[PDB]
Amino acid sequence: KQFAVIGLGAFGGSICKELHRMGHEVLAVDINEEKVNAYASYATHAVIANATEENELLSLGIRNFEYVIVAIGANIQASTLTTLLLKELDIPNIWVKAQNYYHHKVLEKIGADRIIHPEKDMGVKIAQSLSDENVLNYIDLSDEYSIVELLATRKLDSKSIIDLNVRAKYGCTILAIKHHGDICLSPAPEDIIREQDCLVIMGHKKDIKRFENEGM
Amino acid sequence: NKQFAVIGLGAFGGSICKELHRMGHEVLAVDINEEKVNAYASYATHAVIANATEENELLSLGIRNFEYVIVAIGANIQASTLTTLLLKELDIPNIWVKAQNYYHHKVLEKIGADRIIHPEKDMGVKIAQSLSDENVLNYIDLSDEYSIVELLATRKLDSKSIIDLNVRAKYGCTILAIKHHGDICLSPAPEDIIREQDCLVIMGHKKDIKRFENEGM
Amino acid sequence: KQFAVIGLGAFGGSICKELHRMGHEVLAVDINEEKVNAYASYATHAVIANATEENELLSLGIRNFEYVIVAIGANIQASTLTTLLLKELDIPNIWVKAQNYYHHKVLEKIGADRIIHPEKDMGVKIAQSLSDENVLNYIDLSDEYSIVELLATRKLDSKSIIDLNVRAKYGCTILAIKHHGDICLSPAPEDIIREQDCLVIMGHKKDIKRFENEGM
Amino acid sequence: NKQFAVIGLGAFGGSICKELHRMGHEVLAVDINEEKVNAYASYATHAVIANATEENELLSLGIRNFEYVIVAIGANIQASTLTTLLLKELDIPNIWVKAQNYYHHKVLEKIGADRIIHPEKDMGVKIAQSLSDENVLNYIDLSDEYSIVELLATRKLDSKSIIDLNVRAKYGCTILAIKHHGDICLSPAPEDIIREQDCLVIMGHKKDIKRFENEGM
Amino acid sequence: NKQFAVIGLGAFGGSICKELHRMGHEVLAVDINEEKVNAYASYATHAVIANATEENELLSLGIRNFEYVIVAIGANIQASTLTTLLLKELDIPNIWVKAQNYYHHKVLEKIGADRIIHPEKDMGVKIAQSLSDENVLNYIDLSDEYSIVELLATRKLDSKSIIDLNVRAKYGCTILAIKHHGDICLSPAPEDIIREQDCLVIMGHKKDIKRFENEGM
Amino acid sequence: KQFAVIGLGAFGGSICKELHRMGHEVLAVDINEEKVNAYASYATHAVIANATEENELLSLGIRNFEYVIVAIGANIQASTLTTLLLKELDIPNIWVKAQNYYHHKVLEKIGADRIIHPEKDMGVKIAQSLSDENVLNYIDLSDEYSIVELLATRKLDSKSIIDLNVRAKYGCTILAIKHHGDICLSPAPEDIIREQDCLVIMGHKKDIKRFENEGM
Amino acid sequence: KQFAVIGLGAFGGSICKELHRMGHEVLAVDINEEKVNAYASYATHAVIANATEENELLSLGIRNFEYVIVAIGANIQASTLTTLLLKELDIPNIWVKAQNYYHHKVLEKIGADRIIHPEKDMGVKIAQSLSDENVLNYIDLSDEYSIVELLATRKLDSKSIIDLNVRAKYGCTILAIKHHGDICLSPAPEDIIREQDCLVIMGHKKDIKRFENEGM
Amino acid sequence: NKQFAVIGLGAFGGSICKELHRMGHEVLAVDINEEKVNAYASYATHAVIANATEENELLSLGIRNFEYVIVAIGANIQASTLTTLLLKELDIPNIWVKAQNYYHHKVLEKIGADRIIHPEKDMGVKIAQSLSDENVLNYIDLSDEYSIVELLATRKLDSKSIIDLNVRAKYGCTILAIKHHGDICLSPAPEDIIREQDCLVIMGHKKDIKRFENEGM
Ligand SMILES: Nc1ncnc2c1ncn2[C@@H]1O[C@H](COP(=O)(O)OP(=O)(O)OP(=O)(O)O)[C@@H](O)[C@H]1O
Ligand SMILES: Nc1ncnc2c1ncn2[C@@H]1O[C@H](COP(=O)(O)OP(=O)(O)OP(=O)(O)O)[C@@H](O)[C@H]1O
Ligand SMILES: Nc1ncnc2c1ncn2[C@@H]1O[C@H](COP(=O)(O)OP(=O)(O)OP(=O)(O)O)[C@@H](O)[C@H]1O
Ligand SMILES: Nc1ncnc2c1ncn2[C@@H]1O[C@H](COP(=O)(O)OP(=O)(O)OP(=O)(O)O)[C@@H](O)[C@H]1O
Ligand SMILES: Nc1ncnc2c1ncn2[C@@H]1O[C@H](COP(=O)(O)OP(=O)(O)OP(=O)(O)O)[C@@H](O)[C@H]1O
Ligand SMILES: Nc1ncnc2c1ncn2[C@@H]1O[C@H](COP(=O)(O)OP(=O)(O)OP(=O)(O)O)[C@@H](O)[C@H]1O
Ligand SMILES: Nc1ncnc2c1ncn2[C@@H]1O[C@H](COP(=O)(O)OP(=O)(O)OP(=O)(O)O)[C@@H](O)[C@H]1O
Ligand SMILES: Nc1ncnc2c1ncn2[C@@H]1O[C@H](COP(=O)(O)OP(=O)(O)OP(=O)(O)O)[C@@H](O)[C@H]1O
Ligand SMILES: [Mg+2]
Ligand SMILES: [Mg+2]
Ligand SMILES: [Mg+2]
Ligand SMILES: [Mg+2]
């Protein structure tokens, strides 16, 4: 129930703001005074501290937190050393931001609980949108299977779900349609799709992509 | 097989370049750092050392040829800004740019950036939902209220059937898939069973899902 | 009636001193303490502040000023970001100093009310004096027409305005003559011109330049 | 067709070089930065990379050939100073130098600079008159007391004649020109009309003009 | 005649390289500083300028050929760390690394360093025993309790025999050697004499030796 | 009885900790505040001071100490100048850490009492272990003679000291055997040696090395 | 009677110490706090001040001093600007240290009362000692004439002034002989010169140098 | 025609080099800065870019050939120190070195510098005597008590004879020379006259001269 966020960068700042917005106890820690002041209004508490300094860590009472997030990026040494201190303080859950393949590996070795690559991961998602302008967002069930949110084109305007027989034609299933903000869940065969609506389809990627090539 | 130009081979842009090329697209990698160009040389169609703030070098790249130009310059906001400005004045159709903060976004907005992205900001949200709720593995939002969520089944859910968990009536949700031992099951029948540490895909309203988590899981 | 001058450089310093000299309420703002102290005696109020910091801007009560001048030069990012903050604070009149063609463009895009290029503009004026040692100062009515202040040579000593029939000979009109500090406005045909006096002529540039080549 | 040397291709000196050359004069652009030389190469007769504090490189430029040498070095006051000192000792006829502050002016004065210029200081004054008085577009001072001013006509002045506005008797001033829609009118007759957002050129004493502004406009 | 690679030609690694080569071993000296490579060129089998954090340059060295690779990078802990990480992933049998502090040791421990060394830390102890006890010249610890010590004989011990100093019965220790004027004596007989400023080698328990020092010396 | 340690680096830090552990009066001196704070708990007293500043030296009352250790490394000039000040303050025993051959020489010239090369010296010791994996630790009696601690191999398991007739076969003598932590001093001819035990041998290096080649 | 020394470097420090030693009122001014503290005991007053800052100059009451010495070296701009401020404060006597030929020239132009080149001047003196090991010290009366202090060699031991008929042989005159510290002024013809004594000779340089070549 | 090596072409060493060469001596100028070497190239017999802390480059200079080596390195005390140390170990006969402070002198003293010089310190004294006493132009000290001084004659001394000013009896001093309008007079007769703004050379005890100044001048 107690969260600590060390390193109030673009990543950690988002985490801190979002966690706090959910009504959780969040401690924001940063070496820069300007940052601390900025996120003071976004954290339960905001304290200036050097996280590579063990005494300051104890001063924070950091052992009390079940989750501690190290979102230090540019200074790879600081990121590494901070996590190490935390593990030696027997912190249950330590999530750390990684800068490259090698940074992930050392964090792996020293007992980080979960390592994240925000930029590397988003890069993939956006690339998928670049290659395929139709795709708005998606989630991968596996290497082969995914759920995709498509932006309906002119070709689909005023067409029905039975008209788009994705179950037989593409082996897929329509999960939702979003029109002008209104949402429809598990839509009936009588439901109509208009242009520039959001269409949620489920199935194998190649089957979905094929629906895009032929259908959309 | 469109033509992409990627300016700024950082953690973000690097991923884009590697991923775009992997799909078999024509991608030009451009960076001011010579060491980077060598590194991503094996991942791009062409890799060229260039300063994107330099108009002559920009024309030398033949940037007019590209329908999509990606500005993935982060740390140097002025360079990020100045690059986009040149690109807009070169009448590039689609200019996608990485933003560092709220104000960087606004300036990119004003000078006519086509798509602005906040990788860290967006991931912060995604990760935060997992921090607050260890059960959620991944998700997608259909709207402000409705979302599709991938759940990690607990001991509490072991060996239970979909008809036993009538989420359609009890929680107004629907199970979309179950992933067991790597094997995947789509549109599972009411007789299908769920075991612990499997991946469970549920669809519905946020509050309805969270309630299922508190009571079911 | 309320003026704010941010960035007390060579440009802003001149503005601040000159505005204050006219008896206007001027707030001088600079990140450098030495500057603030220096222009303290030249401003109504002088306050140390980082203009890229939004809270300090509100602390200044900058919304209260009808005119805010951003005279930050070297740090182009600061100049840009400051103006942006001001526009988002709905400041009526925002005048900003530009460093180059590109800086003008972004300031243009983000809603600057007037953009100025002090060095670029003066460069032209001085170049005109370099090419033509006779010219002291001028103003352009258009691309073709201008009013010019000439330094009278030996060729013009003790000559009259009717003797210099600029209305017929060059299609121009003499507006003023300055002798030893004494000024003459709308001078009569009987007025005499002595060497090293200031002569103010009006007409087309080529006609004026021709008067210089032939007359002076 | 005199010979000009321009040392310091900054915002100021750059303008000078571009403008002088545009008039068809022989201009030599000299700068310590190689990137600058390339940039202004297209705007100068000759463009040479050189350190103006280096006497041998100075002679290599053949600076003795120039009747006018412009020192437009600003930020580096020592370089600005040291360049002028060399030039004076090379018996250059006319040495014009950019000054950064009051004291820089004094030293340039003492070592025999022929013309010292304060671009920002001078513009500050010009701009300030427009800030305090939005009606004034541009102006020139005949003396400490008398000036010629270009005014932006308001709604209050729309469709009024010059004889209706007898500024010669009422304010002791004279209208010199009216600019309408780009079209220009010189020495306008008393029957000539002025419409809003036109350019109005008035001549007289400062207080007389300002009074006309308060009452007329 | 094993194969050694020495990364980091510092005070520590430099000594290693010089000493290993002196014994007639194949040693490859590798350093990022070009000046260093030249300096230790005369002390290594091969001397190559290389960045040990660069994987391609690492393979170029043929580091796989070496059974022993010594990371003697100190000041730059990230480089020290990153080098070891690469080496472990290249499946190098024995990787010995210099540590700067306690935490640097831990990370080296976790990523599978085979031997970690603390030269300054270890010497600090050795030197400290001489500071506190000027009589001890050098020593070796058999355990936490038992050690072998080299003592500097005082005036108090001059011309005394080993049978006169029955350290075996009186202190439970044994004299192992006496060094006189450079001449060395091993397993000295009970009749052997000790003169001042000679080197005396004693073996036993720490407290027993120190007591002999207080009473004997 | 009074010790001063100037320069709390890796070397000096070890000295300070070890001297203090022995229950000696130790004054830790460092220019860095973080260091001083760190070794505050390891020194009798810890004081921030610049040792190149003579007044601060007198302020420490440094004349009172019989032993002063200068463990400044990176800044060779500071190391040199500090020692010089100390000698001019007539300090009895001044021990100084050296960085290179040349630093030793100047310290030699200005009257340092003992000069130490920690890294250079350890380099030799470790190299001996690299070349000979059997060697754990050693001490040199001279250029030729040494006492060596060997790690017993399979070849020596369950063998006796008379079986290893080092007195006749190699002209050496066994001094101790360490088994599972238990130690044996001046071991009897009946004593057994098991694998991975610690074996202490005394004699000429070549004789010992030969025992390793043939015996072990 | 009032002296100010700005810039407590090697040059200014010597001046300040030497002037103060003579019992004069000396104000030491330096931007570096450590310097100020150091020369505090050597000045009547020692004050931290930036001499390029006009207000601090007035704060010192620098107009009160008849002599102000600017001994700023490395920062040529500071040296120049300081002197300029002083001249504009109408300081009677302004002595300034110069770094090069060009620095002398600008100081010349802005009204420095005396400009000094300590290093350049000493360089000559020492060079004269290098070329001629016999010369200890000297003073030039002109380009041709000088007074020289010579170190007597073996060739001159136990020789008399009439024996060294410098008035006829070399056209010179002996002014003094220094033996073991004892000094002799206007020495008589009976005075003896012993080896390694100090001999003071007056005349033309070439005549003196010739005496060295032939006599000494 | 001895052989001189000059390390450190600063204000001090530069003067030495120029002056030594002017007298027609073989002088080798050595400096780490390439720009300096070019500058003093015209003033030295040979001018070579070299790092004096580099032993190999030092031998490359053939520094053993020189009987005199001048270390005129100031700012970088470690380089100044390290250079001298190398030179002493190369058994150079006479090593003259510039000192920056008291402690730099001591270290140079200890490592066997043959002559140590304090240009600024020495000049400070000379200049100070002129500051306190505007009448003195230049001087030389015979000892702690006795000195020879060059005085600037005032109005008070105009048209006075040497017999009128019997400094030999009245002040125990002697006039050595009078310089008038550039013309010089040595061993002037008692009938010789002194006019204002001439140069007057007086010899004697410091207090005797100063007293003559107070009373005579
Ligand atoms: N030693 C430290 N202790 C605590 N906080 C630190 C330390 N070093 C850096 N930080 C903080 O961590 C924050 C994030 O670091 P930084 O912004 O350099 O990483 P980044 O790669 O830019 O991350 P992002 O991708 O989120 O922008 C910074 O705000 C910084 O103040
Ligand atoms: N003017 C320029 N011209 C060309 N390339 C540039 C320019 N400025 C920066 N870059 C390149 O852009 C790349 C991305 O910038 P950088 O990685 O510093 O941003 P970042 O905030 O760290 O992004 P990420 O979050 O992906 O780490 C850099 O590798 C740099 O080489
Ligand atoms: N972030 C900031 N907030 C407020 N003031 C700033 C900031 N950054 C710089 N300034 C101030 O703006 C002033 C002008 O900037 P600067 O002098 O570098 O521009 P410049 O190009 O030299 O302008 P000029 O042409 O007038 O000399 C400086 O005095 C500086 O103190
Ligand atoms: N020693 C030198 N030799 C030759 N060129 C020089 C030297 N020093 C500076 N310059 C050049 O002078 C140019 C003008 O200087 P700079 O632009 O820094 O002055 P500024 O105050 O910024 O002027 P502006 O107000 O025009 O921006 C610089 O572009 C620089 O390349
Ligand atoms: N990335 C790298 N690749 C190759 N060599 C490196 C790298 N980083 C550092 N080195 C080299 O490692 C050497 C040793 O590092 P350094 O001497 O700074 O450590 P140290 O703590 O000073 O060790 P010592 O105690 O021996 O002085 C340096 O000489 C440097 O040239
Ligand atoms: N002028 C000074 N006065 C006092 N202490 C100083 C001074 N300069 C440096 N020190 C201290 O000396 C300590 C050791 O110096 P440093 O660590 O740079 O040497 P090192 O070569 O790294 O030594 P080691 O081999 O022990 O790591 C540092 O902690 C530093 O704070
Ligand atoms: N702006 C300033 N105002 C006052 N004092 C200053 C200023 N800048 C420098 N100084 C002082 O002037 C002193 C002399 O300057 P510096 O030592 O750099 O010249 P230098 O060439 O080394 O002179 P020297 O030949 O005597 O060693 C320094 O102690 C410094 O603190
Ligand atoms: N390691 C080195 N090898 C060769 N030359 C060097 C080295 N270090 C310094 N020098 C040269 O010595 C010269 C003199 O040093 P520097 O002029 O900085 O001393 P300084 O105190 O300024 O002397 P001065 O009082 O004459 O100005 C410098 O020009 C520099 O080029
Ligand atoms: Mg990032
Ligand atoms: Mg400017
Ligand atoms: Mg070390
Ligand atoms: Mg000097």
Residue numbers in the entry:
A (entry chain A), C (entry chain A), F (entry chain A), G (entry chain A): 7 to 222
B (entry chain B), D (entry chain B), E (entry chain B), H (entry chain B): 6 to 222
Excerpt from the publication:
We introduced the single-point mutations R16A, R16K, A80P and E125Q in KtrA and tested their impact in the complementation assay. However, and contrary to our predictions, none of the R16 mutations had an impact on the growth phenotype, while E125Q resulted in an apparently inactive KtrAB. The structures of R16K (at 2.7 Å resolution) and R16A (at 3.4 Å resolution) with ATP are very similar to that of the previously determined wild-type KtrA-ATP (WT-ATP), adopting the square conformation. A simple indicator of ring conformation is the pair of distances (L1 and L2) separating the Cα of N38 residues located in opposite subunits across a ring face. In the ATP-bound rings, these distances are similar in the R16K (30.8/30.8 Å), R16A (29.9/29.9 Å) mutants and wild-type (30.0/30.0 Å) structures. KtrA mutants that show a wild-type protein function (R16K and R16A) are able to adopt a square conformation with ATP. Importantly, they also reveal that, while R16 does not play a major role in the mechanism, A80 and E125 are crucial residues in the adoption of this conformation. In contrast, KtrAR16AB-ATP is also active in the choline condition without added Mg2+.
